[PDB]
């Protein structure tokens, strides 16, 4: 029942929904943050080519460099998810 809230996105609207969907399947399958992050990272490397990086958690800030149109930062329920492509 995890509510998706997109906080900042430089990414087509299709991929934003795809990102939320893939994160949804990751939370359905895994409970530990690194495992959720690896699931999203690997599926995006496959569906959208390398190189993606994913961070999952409830308390963190970041500063990253990313190809344009390949950045999303959203909440799925209480969990925050940063997904982006650099390289």
């Amino acid at each position: 029942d995890r509510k998706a809230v997109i906080k900042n996105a430089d990414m087509s609207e299709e991929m934003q929904q795809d990102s939320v969907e893939c994160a949804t399947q990751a939370l359905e399958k895994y409970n530990i943050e690194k495992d959720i992050a690896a699931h999203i990272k690997k599926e995006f490397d496959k569906k959208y080519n390398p190189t993606w990086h994913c961070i999952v958690g409830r308390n963190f800030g970041s500063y990253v460099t990313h190809e344009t149109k390949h950045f999303i930062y959203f909440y799925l329920g209480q969990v925050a998810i940063l997904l982006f492509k650099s390289g």
């Binding site: 308390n59 963190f60 990253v64 460099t65 990313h66 344009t68 909440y75 925050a80």
Partner: peptide, 12 residues
Amino acid sequence: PTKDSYTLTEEL
């Protein structure tokens, strides 16, 4: 073509 971005979580 790259670009720099911040993120921060909600306060808890």
